[PDB]
């Protein structure tokens, strides 16, 4: 898996590949690894498909109950709930999750939660097997306060390389745009991104 979230001027964008593998067999080639835990709080899932789905379903439950009582939760609050589950059950879970959300006060925010269950707030984050191949590329190319079109290109070019070199990553590039405007789903097909 290759997943990343990038903050920019208008908010945050989440990107992911669409491939699920058992060994070298591709079980699903059109996986949706971008999952909603709240209206404008989304996450990227890497590691165990079973573990990440179970965690995301529980977090969605917690934030729905939070919203009923105390109104819209912060992106930090969502990351804290993910951390709590991942840290306290670290012995039984294989889940690398990137939490990305849009507040109107805090704008775009990205939190990464590796295997340990530690929380790291970053301008952008990359995770999954394919991320190893694009550390060099992403570090050199990322700028703060990019435009929407710049951030979409940055994610498209980044995951394009991750997919090219990593056998475990492939299929379509799904993206989810989180701004004041709302929620926009984007898809990019091999015939486009392969020849970048």
């Amino acid at each position: 898996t290759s997943i990343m979230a990038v903050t920019f001027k208008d908010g945050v964008i989440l990107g992911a590949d669409s491939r699920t593998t058992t060994g070298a067999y591709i079980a699903n080639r059109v996986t949706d690894k971008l999952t909603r835990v709240h209206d404008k709080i989304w996450c990227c899932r890497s590691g165990s498909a079973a573990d990440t789905q179970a965690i995301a379903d529980i977090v969605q439950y917690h934030l729905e109950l939070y919203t009923s009582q105390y109104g819209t939760p912060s992106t930090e609050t969502a990351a804290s709930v993910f951390k709590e589950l991942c840290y306290e059950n670290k012995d039984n879970l294989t889940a690398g999750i990137i939490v990305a959300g849009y507040d109107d006060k805090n704008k775009g925010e990205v939190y990464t939660i590796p295997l340990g269950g530690s929380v790291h707030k970053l301008p952008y984050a990359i995770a999954g097997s394919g991320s190893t191949f694009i550390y060099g590329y992403c570090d050199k190319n990322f700028r703060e306060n990019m435009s929407k079109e710049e951030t979409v290109d940055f994610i498209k070019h980044s995951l394009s390389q991750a997919i090219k070199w990593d056998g475990s990553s492939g299929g379509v590039i799904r993206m989810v745009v989180l701004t004041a405007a709302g929620v926009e789903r984007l898809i990019f097909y091999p015939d486009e991104y392969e020849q970048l």
Binding site: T1, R19, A27, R45, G47, S48
Partner: peptide, 4 residues
Amino acid sequence: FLWX
């Protein structure tokens, strides 16, 4: 044992 599906991974992502």
